[PDB]
């Protein structure tokens, strides 16, 4: 529901997910061949479900097709300075494609908004909401649309009719977590094949031994996992697939 | 929320003797014709244990906080179900981590939180003119609680809300060990036909779900419900109605116990090894037969009670510094 | 919805009286402020505090709000004659892209002692029986507190069909008074011998009945 | 500042609902106005927040395509329409201001609040009223006081008030509530306890006002002659 869903957010107030007591695989993310752009820094993009870390957190919102290139931690410009700022040690895993079919309709879309004004910058990962109108010179106004008080948040220009570079794209960001803490969430082993009758090596959460797999004739208790034997030998493990 | 009691006539606890009662799995391995024994917490045979009654025909309610140490065993001979749940903790001050495993009519709530638990909490059952069942309405377990991390749901169990005088029918035995902080739960029910006095069966138990929650409990206490009849007139001061209940409290000794295992793979027989000494030559000779001839068991050592030392003729003092 | 609260909350006048709100990780454990209200019975509900560290202006300093990592927490110091309200817990859900209220929990004494009831029973009129129905009034007045089971029979049978009850209200005198109604028809209006409406009170019965003929 | 909503108003099941809100003063063409409702029996909702200055709406996924509110810098009001309604939409509604800050959190809350609007829909559409007078017996009268007064029934909408002489008569009144019948009609009466020494020398009336039906019926009260 975070990347399919009837509408999302925008920028000054985007949706905050957080994943926990859960457990995913993230090789369907990666064979999608549906994604415009991909960019993971911190860790390779192949060789992220092995390690695992404590949370895991996923932010969605809509930005333009040309500011996808904006997303990266150190540089300067209008909306990754004012909106959502990228610390230096950042290990996010940003993800981008483009489904203008959905959040674009004729006459002019403008349901989703945006900060241009503010008064200084920002602490990173930190959601601004306010709708104050920034002051640019040293007199009050009272809040009217007049002289030397501008409206900070201005409307879209999402048209379905546009090039590429000013579609509306769905961007979202994962981001880990490294605390002193169990992972909430972990990467699993991938299952393999099932083998049997022939010399192969196992790991069956308790005992690591080379051997065949040969097929039982007793049925044991369903609250066990191993099985020992008269010589004190563990030669009997349920498979639990 | 709950209410305060009066101070009315009981009857003192008797005590039993057990009957090869307290055995369990000691691990979660397959054993099949191989006598092996294990040094885990298991209750000795022919033991005194305690005896608390629950019957109405007077006014028995008793429900004291006794104290929980490694491995106990609560076997109760159920019959309709009276016995709702129990709860742990230290000080029951809403200051530890408080255990809150009850067994309702809709599903099994295991909640370790830190909820204010009172003097006596009991579940209580009204019975409705319009409609002939017996209900519960009466929530009287806690207050309230503040913030919380831990919460499991168990598989949904059905319970008969109606409390009669007969014969039991049913035996339940529970199981609670705390090692590593982690909680274990031996449970299995076996019908039989008494009402005092177990006999000299033999019946396993085997775990269910393992609860990893890394808290220590030196203090339990078990939860009893009542019924409100048309008899009673409804206030829980002197006149109240409880069923027919009998269940038994006993404590686990770390005592190595032989365990044998047939081809299918159950547990058959358990043998001590410090209680008897035939019992313990035969879990030290590994074998359920005995044939004629002397063997050795252990060793005998006599422990010195008193220490005589002392320093005659002499004395002094050492300035420091 | 998300959002659930107990549904009451006991407390004595003088100590220490908390609550808690329990969500999910998405809506209060995600990282939203959470923000109370008190919704008085009887007028706009204000602000109380937002983002659990900031005072607003005109809300006395015995409100303190606490978050302890997904749960939010309010405590209160002694009980005045204006906590007759609800207290909810709002924050903003992003499963439901936008913000979602709490269920509220009801905190107030009753105040409200026996009292021995006086009830009237009062036939319809002449006027009223041929406009093809039949009024059946029951006014009970002067008791405390206000709730009357109201019960109607016909001297041999209840009635099961037509009865109402309204709320009582306060009268000047702090007593409170209500009145029971009986929609029925003025061709069975007289074949019957009487009707009468019986209550309780505490176990008080008091019966009144009257005589079309 | 403070925000002034319209009073009770009863529609058609299944009609459009016109209400609006008005500001006194400034401070509303510059921060965002949402809708909160509130009904007994459950929790409080929030359909969505519209902004002034850019005229963006932004509405909620629990709630379908069927409310739209719109807003006015002429005057700076707001206008609430709703059509197709049903038989849960009897609620209040709510015209809240918001305030936007910074923070780690940064959650919607809202500081100014409006007055409120009951919008109440259900069956039993605006009709004529009846009044019914009522008069004591011998039996009723055993001591020095009477009981009687006038019986108010299929009336609709709420409210309504009750009066005797003009406001001549004050000690002594009653005014019950109203109370939710069968077909949805509501039902009340008043009762005055007056000596028996004035029932041959003073007349007492019943004055009901009612202004949505732009009616007020003038009834008179007599004792009975047969006891
Ligand atoms: C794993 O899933 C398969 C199919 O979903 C099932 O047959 C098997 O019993 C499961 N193993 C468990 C629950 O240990
Ligand atoms: C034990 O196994 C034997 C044969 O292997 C079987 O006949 C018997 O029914 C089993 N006992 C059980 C399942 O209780
Ligand atoms: C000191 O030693 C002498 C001889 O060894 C003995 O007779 C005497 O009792 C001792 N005094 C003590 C132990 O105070």
Request: charged residues 15%; glycine residues 8%; contains cysteine.
């Amino acid at each position: 529901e975070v990347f399919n869903a009837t509408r999302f957010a925008s920028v000054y107030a985007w949706n905050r997910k957080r994943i926990s007591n859960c457990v995913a695989d993230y090789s369907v993310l990666y064979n999608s061949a549906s994604f415009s752009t991909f960019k993971c820094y911190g860790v390779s993009p192949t060789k992220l479900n092995d390690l695992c870390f404590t949370n895991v957190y996923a932010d969605s919102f809509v930005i333009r097709g040309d500011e996808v290139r904006q997303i990266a931690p150190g540089q300067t410009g209008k909306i990754a300075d004012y909106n959502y700022k990228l610390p230096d040690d950042f290990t996010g895993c940003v993800i981008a494609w483009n489904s203008n079919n959905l959040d674009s309709k004729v006459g002019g879309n403008y349901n989703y908004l945006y900060r241009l004004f503010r008064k200084s910058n920002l602490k990173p990962f930190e959601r601004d909401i306010s709708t104050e109108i920034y002051q640019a010179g040293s007199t009050p106004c009272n809040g009217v649309e007049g002289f030397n008080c501008y409206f900070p948040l201005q409307s879209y220009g999402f048209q379905p009719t546009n090039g590429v570079g000013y579609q509306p794209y769905r961007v979202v960001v994962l981001s880990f977590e490294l605390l002193h803490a169990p992972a909430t969430v972990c990467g699993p082993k991938k299952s393999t094949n099932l083998v049997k009758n022939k010399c192969v090596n196992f790991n069956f959460n308790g005992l690591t031994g080379t051997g065949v797999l040969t097929e039982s004739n007793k049925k044991f208790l369903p609250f066990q996992q191993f099985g020992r034997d008269i010589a004190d030998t563990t030669d009997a493990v349920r498979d639990p697939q | 929320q709950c209410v305060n009691l009066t101070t009315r006539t009981q009857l003192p606890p008797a005590y039993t003797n057990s009957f090869t009662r307290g055995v369990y799995y000691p691990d979660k391995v397959f054993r099949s014709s191989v006598l092996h024994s294990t040094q885990d917490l298991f209750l000795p045979f022919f033991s005194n244990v305690t005896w608390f009654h629950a019957i109405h025909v007077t006014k028995r309610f008793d429900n004291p906080v006794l104290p929980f140490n490694d491995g106990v065993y609560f076997a109760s001979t159920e019959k309709s179900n009276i016995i709702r749940g129990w709860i742990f903790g230290t000080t029951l001050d809403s200051k530890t981590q408080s255990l809150l495993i009850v067994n309702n009519a809709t599903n099994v709530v295991i909640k370790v939180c830190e909820f204010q638990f009172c003097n006596d909490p009991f579940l209580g059952v009204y019975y409705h003119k319009n409609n002939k069942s017996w209900m519960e309405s009466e929530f009287r377990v806690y207050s309230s609680a503040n913030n919380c991390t831990f919460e499991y749901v168990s598989q949904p169990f059905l319970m008969d809300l109606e409390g009669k005088q007969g014969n039991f029918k049913n035996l339940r035995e529970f199981v609670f060990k705390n090692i590593d902080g982690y909680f274990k739960i031996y449970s299995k029910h076996t019908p039989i036909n008494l009402v005092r006095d177990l006999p000299q069966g033999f019946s396993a138990l085997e775990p269910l779900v393992d609860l990893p929650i890394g808290i220590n409990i030196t203090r339990f206490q078990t939860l009893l419900a009542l019924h409100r009849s048309y008899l009673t007139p409804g206030d829980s001061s002197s006149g109240w109605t409880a069923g027919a209940a009998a269940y038994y409290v006993g404590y686990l000794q770390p005592r190595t116990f032989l365990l044998k295992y047939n081809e299918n793979g159950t547990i058959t027989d358990a043998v001590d090894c410090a209680l008897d000494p035939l019992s313990e030559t035969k879990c030290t000779l590994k074998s359920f037969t005995v044939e004629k001839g002397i063997y050795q068991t252990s060793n005998f050592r006599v422990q010195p009670t008193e220490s005589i030392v002392r320093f005659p003729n002499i004395t002094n003092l050492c300035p420091f510094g | 919805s998300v959002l659930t609260q107990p549904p009451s909350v006991s407390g004595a006048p003088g100590q220490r009286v908390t609550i808690s709100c329990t969500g999910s990780s998405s809506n209060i454990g995600a990282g939203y402020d959470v923000h109370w209200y008190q919704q008085l019975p009887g007028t706009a509900p204000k602000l109380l505090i937002y983002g659990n560290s900031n005072r607003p202006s005109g809300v006395p300093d015995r409100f303190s709000g606490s978050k302890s990592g997904t749960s939010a927490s309010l405590a209160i110091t002694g009980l005045q004659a204006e906590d007759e309200a609800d207290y909810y817990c709002q924050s903003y859900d992003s499963s439901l892209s936008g913000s979602v209220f709490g269920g509220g929990t009801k905190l107030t004494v009753l105040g409200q002692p026996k009292a021995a009831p006086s009830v009237t029973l009062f036939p319809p009129s002449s006027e009223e029986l041929q406009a093809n129905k039949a009024t059946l009034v029951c006014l009970i007045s002067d008791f405390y507190p206000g709730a009357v089971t109201v019960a109607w029979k016909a001297d041999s049978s209840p009635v099961k069909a037509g009865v109402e009850t309204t709320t009582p209200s306060k009268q000047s005198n702090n007593k409170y008074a209500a009145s029971s109604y009986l929609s029925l028809t003025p061709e069975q209006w007289k074949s019957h011998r009487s009707y009468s409406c019986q209550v309780t009170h505490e176990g008080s019965t008091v019966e009144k009945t009257v005589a079309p003929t | 500042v403070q925000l002034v909503e319209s009073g009770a108003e009863v529609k058609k099941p299944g009609s459009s609902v016109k209400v609006s809100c008005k500001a006194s003063g400034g401070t509303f063409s510059s921060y965002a106005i949402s809708w909160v409702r509130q009904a007994p029996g459950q929790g409080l909702e929030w359909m969505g927040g519209i902004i002034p200055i850019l005229g963006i709406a932004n509405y909620a996924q629990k709630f379908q395509g069927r409310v739209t509110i719109t807003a006015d810098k002429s005057t700076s009001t707001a206008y609430m329409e709703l059509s197709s309604l049903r038989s849960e939409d009897t609620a209040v509604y709510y015209c809240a201001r918001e305030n936007g800050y910074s923070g780690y959190g940064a959650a919607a809350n809202f500081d100014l609040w409006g007055r409120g609007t009951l919008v109440t829909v259900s069956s039993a559409s605006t009709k004529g009223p009846s009044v019914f007078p009522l008069a004591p017996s011998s039996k009723s009268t055993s001591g020095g006081t009477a009981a009687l007064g006038c019986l108010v029934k299929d009336y609709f909408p709420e409210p309504v008030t009750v009066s005797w002489n003009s406001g001549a008569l004050t000690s002594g009144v009653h005014t019950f509530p109203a109370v939710l019948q069968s077909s949805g009609l509501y039902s009340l009466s008043s009762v005055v306890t007056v000596p028996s020494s004035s029932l041959g020398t003073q007349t007492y009336i019943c004055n009901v006002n009612h202004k949505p039906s732009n009616t007020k019926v003038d009834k008179k009260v007599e004792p009975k002659s047969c006891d």
